[PDB]
Amino acid sequence: SLSAGTVSGASYAWYTDAGTSNQFSTLQNPTVNNLTNDSTFYLLVTVNGCPSALDSTTVVVYPLTPSPSLPADFAVCEGDDIALSTSTVASSYDWSGPNGFTSNAQNPVVITNATGSNAGVYTLSIVDGNGCSSADTSVQVTVNAAPAQPSMTTNSPICNGADLVMSTSATGNSYIWRAPNGADTTTASSTLTIVPTSSLYQSGNWTLSVVNAAGCVSPASIASAVEINSI
Amino acid sequence: SLSAGTVSGASYAWYTDAGTSNQFSTLQNPTVNNLTNDSTFYLLVTVNGCPSALDSTTVVVYPLTPSPSLPADFAVCEGDDIALSTSTVASSYDWSGPNGFTSNAQNPVVITNATGSNAGVYTLSIVDGNGCSSADTSVQVTVNAAPAQPSMTTNSPICNGADLVMSTSATGNSYIWRAPNGADTTTASSTLTIVPTSSLYQSGNWTLSVVNAAGCVSPASIASAVEINSI
């Protein structure tokens, strides 16, 4: 909007060109549309028939708010957490995304249990210190599925001194075998042999978790009892 | 904003220089932009063609609100609490940080279970008693990870009078061994030997916790039974 002071007996005229030509409005306080850069307007006031000196104005145009900075497209495993953030400072942040994710923060509340419904594209827009809105910038999040619960078979009726052999049919890159006392071991193969001299040669309830190509750990298997008998 | 009283038949002129030169506006109530310190303006009113005495004004500028005082960068262990506060008095406080932390208090609600998602930079800004905003000041919080659950092996089939020997493979600075009745002991070594004359020579379910370099205590191990038999 442009403006001019009130003068009794005055008529007003605004021009877009010094030299008093290319008139644009005969209102006192006319508007200007679509400003993209700094521009000037000229006011010439005429009271009783005499024109005044020409009085120019400059409308200063605030620069473009730059796009918000986001993490590159990332990848979480189901069960992990999606921590979004932006490195840029703003008066106001506006985030939106999958599953209705909505927030007003530089560092939004972390999604604590990633699942398939939280995968997708998360978008951020920013309001600068001057009031101008930035263009939207977004990050894609892929959530990698975990393997299903493995099944485990053991040679459970063991006489002490005989090897303990545990095996699965589950498929993954690596297998995590967990002892009754919490000790574990990771194997590349589906079959684990425990030698009587090992700290893992123990009776009780054993479990298996399987790790896939994406590095996701399956739910643990239903424990299988191992019984090591005396001689 | 500047102002002047209404006088019938008057025109108004404001000057930035006593001596009646460097005119700045012919409005009654013009504005002043970007004041950084105290400044004066001069009003000269002219009704019927006669100028008035020059009447000066002084615009007083309120000092800068100083930066809020925060704790130095600190460090919590996972499971401990992050207690933020500021020592300065204000009309309004505005805190923000990791995990969406937001508050309006001199002493914000304490984060009661520190974890990795609460680590990061916490920022505070202040509004003074006069309405002026301070510059942002921040404190970084590092949350130190606890060790994983230890595994424990004991020589459980013990004849009374024989030593009780307990050991782990877990790594840390110190090991906390906890007796069935709650009594405990801390060792530098991974192996604990309990002499029959000790108050710790007791049967039941024993556990182990391990302490790392940062001083964090691991989750306790799965209890191992110890059985001390009579002769």
CB A28 within 8 A of CB A13: no
DSSP conformation class of B72: -
CA B150 – CA B178 distance, rounded (Å): 13
Identify the CA nearest to A99 among candidates A74, A116, A75. Answer: A116
Strands A55-59 and A39-47: antiparallel
Q: How many CA atoms lie within 13 A of B65 on its CB side?
A: 21
Going by their DSSP bridges, the two strands A204-211 and A224-229 should be labelled as antiparallel
- CA A124/CA A67 separation, integer angstroms: 9
**Exposed, middle or buried: residue B168 (CB in 10 Å: 0-12, 13-18, 19+)?**
buried
Cα–Cα distance for residue pair A185/A191, rounded to 1 Å: 12
Contact B100 A81 (CB under 8 A): no
Non-local (6+) Cβ contacts of A34 within 8 A are: none
- Quickly list DSSP for chain A: -------TTEEEEEEEETTTEEEEE-SSS-------S-EEEEEEEEETTEE---EEEEE--PPPPPPPP---SEEEETTS-B-----S--SEEEEE-GGG-EE-SSSPPPBSS--GGG-EEEEEEEE-TTSPBPPPEEEEEEEEPPPPPP-EEE--EEEBTBPEEEEE---SSEEEEE-TTS-EEEESSSEEEE-TTSTT---EEEEEEEE-TT-PBPPPPPPEEEEEE--
Tell me the shortest Cα–Cα distance from A33 to chain B, in angstroms.
24
What CA–CA distance (Å, rounded) separates B131 from B34?
17
Check A183 against B100: CB less than 8 A apart: no
Residue of B nearest to A85 (CA): B98
B:142-181 residues touching chain A, CB 8 A cutoff:
149-153, 169
Q: How was this structure determined?
A: cryo-EM
Residues B117, A81: C-beta atoms closer than 8 Å: yes
Cβ of A182 within 8 Å of Cβ of B221? The answer is: yes
DSSP strand pairing (A191-194 vs B184-187): unpaired
At B92, list the tokens: 């309004």
**Whole-number Å distance between alpha carbons of A7 and A43:** 13
CB-CB neighbors (< 8 A) of A181 in chain B: 151-153, 221-222, 224
- Rounded to whole angstroms, the Cα distance separating B215 from B172 reads 9
The answer to whether A53 touches A43, Cβ cutoff 8 Å, is: no
Taking a C-beta distance cutoff of 8 angstroms, is the pair A68, A85 a contact?
no
Question: What residues contact residue B96 under an 8 Å CB cut-off, 6+ apart?
Answer: A105, A106, A107, B102, B122, B123
The amino acid at residue B17 is: D
* A229 phi/psi in degrees, rounded to 5: -95, 155
Which resolution in angstroms does this entry have? 3.4
Burial class (CB in 10 A: 0-12, 13-18, 19+), A211: middle
The CA distance from B161 to B225, in Å, is 18
Q: Is A115 on the interface with B (CB under 8 A)?
A: no
Residues of B in contact with A83 (CB under 8 A): 117
